[model samples]
Target: KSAKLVDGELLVKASVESFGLEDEKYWFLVCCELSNGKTRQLKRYYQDFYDLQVQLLDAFPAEAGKLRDAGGQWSKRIMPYIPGPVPYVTNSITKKRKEDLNIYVADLVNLPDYISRSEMVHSLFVVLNN
Candidate 1:
């Protein structure tokens, strides 16, 4: 999942998998689909993506870290949803996540300004390169 700029548009679906274990950490799994009909999955600790957000925030203050911001910016794309008891445990959390994440990813990559910037694309590439 290193990334291919000329490889065409990128599609991403992501979610946080709760371990409900000893610590408070959660796993972040991202499903990716490139316009070439190739797909891949990238998984990491939530902190991994968080750190990337922080890095992007520092590098581009007004540009990134929308996930950290709560309800203020309408531009926020990567959203973290607070999960409630799903009437049923999850038969397909992955399926539901992709539906949600795909919407979020579509918003991001389709941004009138963001998709055109190399810094934005490259910054995300660094994090997704698993």
Candidate 2:
């Protein structure tokens, strides 16, 4: 079984469909599906996602600033989980990173309504269509 994004419109869900080596580095391809029935395949490095998380934190300091607790125990916001950059890459490590990225995107689009509707979020989803 795979992970499912929360039901809604717009940037609904995203997953790291596959990965491969290019230019002596690894690239993970993500499939992001919108509610309007549009799809895009984004080719990215692990660092790209890491940068995204950093930008998110900067954009929404109040919401994405801290880690979320269990059942809204400490914080109301759900911070997207992005693993740190790995200096070494292996088959199992790459596969595991894919899973982590899957969750990262889901958590990103599943944020509060205001945050999800912002241009910041839209801009992130709009690019990388080539």
Candidate 3:
């Protein structure tokens, strides 16, 4: 499962690094890589992404619980790619929460309802974690 063809050719995340604006006002990361056979920089500013993190982590556990955990392994697998914009959902946080949780995992696992013995780790997770 080293190569996952999602939006295009496999995304090879070569490096992820952070840099601050000229007086250190804010720090942003440039997730650099080869996706679609081209190098693209997807910016995730720390402050904004962290804000999104707080928002996302609220519902993250439902997905996490489904992914479950054993020996702290397989914990990060099964984050269904929201596949849109960052901050994940741009609006309707309440409604999105009610709908998104089971929908994504349900689609992936297809159990009528699901974790994993070899659940694929989400590409975005692989990209951002490093």
Candidate 4:
């Protein structure tokens, strides 16, 4: 992720992630820019598209426990790191739009420069040590 902190506000840039479907796995390569002008690359794996769907559902639950709602929430939290406006919710019936509020895994994974790849490596070492 690449971003900059200007006057205590974050301005982010475009991010990208590529996913490919394999026999039973989905491989992904993600790149993101932060407002501070840093870039990050991440590799991910999913058992399949179905698995990814399942994971997304979990991440963004439309209903209290429904998959879509949860996924929406997750989408909201992560989108900011991608340097774009947040996604809004549109009511199918009323056609009203509202801001989606939820925590996204991407937000957690795509942190600022204080946490670097080296820090990730150190974290892994700490986990293994435990």
Candidate 5:
């Protein structure tokens, strides 16, 4: 599983394990524990994260710009690191990708109340009852 709850308040957590090829591209398995108390597994690609990165930037241009300006020091400023898309994936690379993706999900769900509670971040991890 890729996700878990850190604490009752922390809400969501995630991790990536294993990978598969569909449509000639690698897709990682993301196991996330949603705020709703259900663990949902999803197949996602680097492209999916990249798209999320874009959406986040668009959602908060100031934060995105500050991150770019701060470069590697964004972490020091207490900002969550968003992983960029990787050009290739192999066994070793897959291992690293898992770590990076896990960090991304953790960062995403831990954002400030206004950001994390948004549909962009919340709905994606939830399991639809229908």
Candidate 6:
């Protein structure tokens, strides 16, 4: 899944945040590029993603406390580079009931062209950075 940002001028490269041996956290970040041709990083809490989806269903019932706790654990380790309260809104949702509900956000930014363009050359370095 992906998101577009800043009037489609930037794109966010989406991936499941890692839990390395050095750290045990599941954080997500949207990778985008600035106008200056340098890539910029933005981090997000996974709980925000979970809560937004749970809010959509007509009679959704989930352990909010658990979700919040889990998100908080991850948030403590990973900090947002932008330094502000990250605003999360459910731009769209597709509910299939039993299976995991796939959530979509219309306003999220897209991953920059440079990242995709240099995939082969910089793939190793990019993965290391994340």
Query: Against the hidden true structure, what lDDT does model 3 obtain?
Result: 0.38
State the C-alpha lDDT per candidate.
Answer: 0.42, 0.65, 0.38, 0.32, 0.59, 0.29
**Candidate 2: where are CA atoms >4 Å away?**
1-9, 65-75, 124-129
Q: Please rank every candidate by TM-score, starting with the best.
A: 2, 5, 1, 3, 4, 6
* Candidate 4 lDDT (Cα, 0 to 1): 0.32
Residue 43 alpha-carbon offset, candidate 5, angstroms? 1.1
Which candidate ranks first by TM-score, i.e. highest?
2
Kindly give the stretch of ten consecutive residues in candidate 3 with the minimal lDDT sum: 112-121
Q: Mind giving the per-residue lDDT tens digits that candidate 1 earns over 12-89?
A: 422222233235443444544444665544445434444544444444443444334455645533322333324443
Q: Could you tell me which residue pairs clash in candidate 5?
A: 2-15, 2-31, 3-31
What is candidate 4's lDDT per residue for 40-85, written digit by digit as tens?
5544432222333343334434322433433334533222211123
Please say which candidate is ahead in lDDT: 3 or 5.
Answer: 5
lDDT of 2 by residue, 1-130 (tens): 1122333556667666778779987777777787688887757667667777777776665575554445545546556656667777677887888888877776666766455545554555655545
Alpha carbon lDDT at 111, candidate 4: 39
Per lDDT, the best of the predicted structures is 2
- Candidate 2 backbone collisions, by pair: none
2 against 3, candidate with superior lDDT: 2
Kindly list the per-residue Cα lDDT of model 5 for residues 44-111, writing each as its tens digit: 55766776666766666555544354454433223445545556656787778777877776676666
* lDDT-based ranking: 2, 5, 1, 3, 4, 6
